[PDB]
Symmetry: C5
Subunit: 314 residues, 5 copies
């Protein structure tokens, strides 16, 4: 019996990539072709039915199986549908879809993470013994040209047909609760320019500003105090505002570690100033070797750490 | 008489956990099976009906009872439906649902709180004398593996069949106003890493920054003035911003008490500086035993308080 | 003639209290019972019709009057409906509703205000000469426990049946433009803990910090300058963020008067410091009775004002 | 031939005034009465049809013209409808509507601007040669007695019936493309209390704080430096946050000019301090006539500017 | 064969231009006229059908093709529809639409960028061999006068009728997979007043404030320290808040480069002050030629940079 269904999915665009809710909107077309009883259309050309007569056609016994996306969040926005009825028997169901899909994303390497936009299509009411997906072909011609998003599409699409077992139908369908599933995966990487400008360069210049304190002698303590407190508060607000752009994930990201290292450098600069002020105890000059060596240690350590960082993750 | 209805609920995913509105979105499938009068299916195969033919079947007298979720917020997003009609009489209703459900949450131990995601399913128009839930089986196979939400699910779901009394039917149905109710409960705990990084570490480093003032002698008043005002304003902004992620609840949370203790420490450090400034009335220094002992009292008290706090709530 | 209709409203929950839009969401059930012409049910048992046959039944001449909420914002989300048809003629319409209702709210005593949640139900197309509300019974069993979500429910519900005249039907229906209206009112008060923690305690501690300036002599001008400018800016931002939680109503609230008094206290402290700095020369030396008396006048005045304030409104 | 249609519009409430999108939500009732061919009602009483039978009535040839709001944003929320059918032929269509309407607003005098809430009703598919609006009666009894939510209603509503030509139907119907249009206009003014408290009083007190620097001698420069930089930064953030509540327009508002003048005053105070500090070089405590005359020039100039401003626009 | 379809698009308004999501809402009317088989209308006058009979007419064999927008995001909000049926055979489909359309936008020249609002209309189910677009006419009479809502319309609308090939229909339609497409493009430029007031004037005045430091001698290190740190932090927050109004695009905009140059100037001023402080040796006046030349170089370089900048991009 099992009806062989050939599926072709045209992807018009991907957008609305919300990393907080871990959703992304997909606009495209879906074509589902199977082979039924032969028919006689007016002329050799096949007959075309637009959405509403479709009801009547399935009310008079025409078999049109309902397909459903698993990753969708809420009923996907279904546009116009159409039925092409061929004289040689093949029936084709074509519909436009606008859907908010979901997929598990891992942000450990954020903002250098690699993710996948996934479509999991699956028939309803019909198991693999009744309906089986023969082939799948994805035509991603629109987005593959330029990868227009805050993301970058890396490579062609991947297709896979699998069989998924549901235990909640075993109470009904005995030993017949396996459904055929089409899986479409699109690999993508994150472009870091926005994140550079918004968090990395601010942290770098904040560390530089903190280091500027070293090139003052055991001078007006308020000046270096202003440096220290200003820089530590700036780094705190930067860490908060940077992690506000991610979901509340127990694990730490690469941006988290970078911010932590910059925070440690700024706090170490402040503690160094406090230390060298604790050792002044005198109305003499005696410029301190501590600051003279810090003026080199801090920038050189920051530079080699940045080299290690950016050599990693890239 | 009472029609025994067997229910199986497959939960595809839980997401959209909004602690402000105390809602959470649940996507899954629902199966409701009962045994009616025998019928004649076409062929030996049981009959399958997809949503629209369903109308015709309920127009020709087929009895399909309406079930409803109590925790839902608005009409739940209903996907595709299906009826499996068996020759031996049993009818089976299978449908996908995506709903925003509600449940009373208690935030006294926030962010260490433990909550439960609840589904309250119940028939409409039919009491326990007409329709009764025989058994319930929940299949939470997808999410129980790794908990990739902002929460952590601990264990399988709990099922409960109960009888609920309604006073708004007591005005008509005397002593016959009891409805069968299925309740599915999923226990969850909150991951605190986001809250750690966003409020606790900032508060801790702000307390450290406030304590740094002790390591300046009593002469430069402005430096320690900047320290005190900077730290108290930072702690105020942190107190404000921390409760921004919670509903407006009259009661206090654990994070509230932690912030209050940190604020007390910062303000007490500032008042200590003001006190040692009150003894400046001289042209002498006499480095103050107050600061010399504070450099130990403040950090040690903060450390033992952190020990007590983090030993509690965990 | 006038058909007597008995109405019972079961309130499942009240939530979504948006003080900005002056709206609130109510989820519950509505029951409307009247006595019509007798009918012949299959068997002695009364007949039950679930939503869809309902259409068919009114297509065969069944008279089902349309009821409407006046306070509602948009078409309320109606869940499942049901008709209980008795052989003796009485009809019962039971349906679940979830609606966003509106009511004029007065925020003069904010955040100590007391408000009312109102439901104004009224028939459509039928006047008091055709349809009359006989009795009303509200069954608020779920929420009566002094529920959560920023408010406190004080007492049971109040019911009132009235007659409202419409001038826009006078152009057609002469002397027949009076409609019967059911009004359900639920008194509620606001929990102030959130508002305390978010604005009052910050303002109080800001005033305390501003007063701390007095315990510095008139010598270090910058320290007290930092105190004054920091505190006045803090109070300005606090006033802004405090009125950010209210609609643009133009009248003054209790929070407005409290913030204004705290602002006056902070600015008066700054002005006192500026005056004594203009008097650091021209007639004083190193100690001033002005500060010695301010250290008592400012805290005592603030305390007695706080006593008067908090004794009021409570 | 042309069907004379009598229209009566009851306005229940106006709310949701979003100045950013220049929209406003209007809830009310609409009545449209015309005189058609006589019919046979059951009994002498006229017939009443509630929405759903309405379909059947328009399915058997009853002529019900479609009306449309032009200013509406999206399909307006249509509640319950009703048809009153008289035996002498006259038909009456009554329906509740809730719509988000739009109207061109000019914000040059903001926040002292005067705007108009407009309803543009117009038939669809039928020109003035087939359907003509005879008269209009607006019954704004509910809301006109009081304020709205943030605005003030000045006077009753104004009505106008006009004829509008559409060029996109000129391609088909030659010289018969004129449509009758009903226009309802309600004048409104903006309440300024919120804007006063949120921007005007903050700017005024910021100018006062900036002027406080003058009452410090050419003493420790950091204090007056703190004054200047604090005040200029405060005025910058205030200007930004003030224009954040308006759409991104090209012209300047009254609030813009007020903030600009305050900014000029603050920056001039800072520049004055910088100038007198370039002349502070001396070893005497000589107080400068520049500051002594500024202590009068700046407050008096600000006061006369405030007088001119508030005398204008009011 | 190919049915020539004439299309006319009336644009009522364009609004809701969200640059973050790169969407814009378009409300208007659409008219599609073709020539079918002659019919007999009641009288010689054409027949008019209002939405609901439309169903019936397509149920009795009337051919009404479904058209679809490609740039739309989700199912467009369709208002009222209408069919004008002429006796000479021509059919006209007229409907009001309100849709959120999308178009690829390039923000490299932001905020001086030039963009285009695009509508791509295209038939469904019918290729160029079955349905062909004969002509297209856009009537943008209402909105073309104002150029309102943060943009400026430059010129009338442009049309392009093309044939687009779909490779995902080659599996079904061999050599018959070309669809006729109407493309309407409206060129527009961005109004910069809002962006001027919100970022440019703040950055310019911040550069001025930073330069003010030169007019203080090298005596009070803290005053110029406050100047430097305040100005660099202000520029950092301004850059962040400025890019907060844009999508996360890997490339840099003109506003980005302006902010970068202002940041470089401010940081260079601070570094210059630190250098001149490193020359504090020679405890006699020794005022430094560095400041004497900076007081001219910094303002003159900033002025010539502003001249080059604003002469470009304009």
């Amino acid at each position: 019996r099992p009806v062989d269904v050939s599926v072709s999915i045209f992807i018009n665009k991907i957008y609305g990539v919300n990393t907080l809710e871990q959703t992304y909107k997909v606009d495209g077309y879906i074509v589902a072709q199977w082979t039924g009883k032969p028919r006689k259309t007016p002329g050799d050309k096949p007959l075309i039915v637009e959405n509403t007569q479709i009801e009547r056609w399935i009310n008079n016994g025409l078999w049109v199986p309902a397909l459903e996306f698993i990753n969708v969040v809420g009923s996907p926005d279904t546009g116009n549908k159409r039925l092409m009825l061929f004289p040689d028997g093949r029936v084709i169901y074509n519909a436009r879809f606008l859907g908010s899909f979901s997929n598990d994303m891992d942000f450990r390497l954020f903002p250098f993470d690699r993710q996948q936009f996934v479509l999991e299509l699956e028939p309803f009411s019909y198991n693999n013994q009744q309906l089986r997906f023969s082939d799948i072909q994805v035509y991603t011609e629109n987005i593959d040209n330029e990868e227009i998003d805050e993301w970058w599409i890396r490579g062609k699409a991947s297709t896979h047909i699998s069989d998924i077992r549901y235990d909640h139908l075993s109470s009904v369908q005995p030993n017949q609760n396996e459904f055929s599933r089409i899986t479409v995966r699109i690999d993508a990487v994150r472009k870091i320019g926005y994140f550079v400008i918004q968090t990395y360069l601010p942290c770098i210049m904040t560390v530089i500003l903190s280091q500027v304190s070293f090139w003052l002698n055991r001078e007006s303590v308020p000046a270096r105090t202003v440096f220290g407190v200003t820089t530590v508060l700036t780094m705190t607000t930067l860490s908060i505002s940077a992690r506000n752009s991610l979901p509340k994930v127990a694990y730490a990201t690469a941006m988290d570690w970078f911010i932590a290292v910059c925070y440690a450098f700024v706090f170490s600069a402040l503690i160094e100033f406090a230390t060298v002020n604790y050792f002044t105890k005198r109305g003499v000059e005696s410029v301190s070797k501590i600051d003279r060596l810090s003026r080199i240690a801090f920038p050189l350590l920051f530079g080699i750490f940045n080299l290690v960082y950016w050599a990693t993750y890239l």
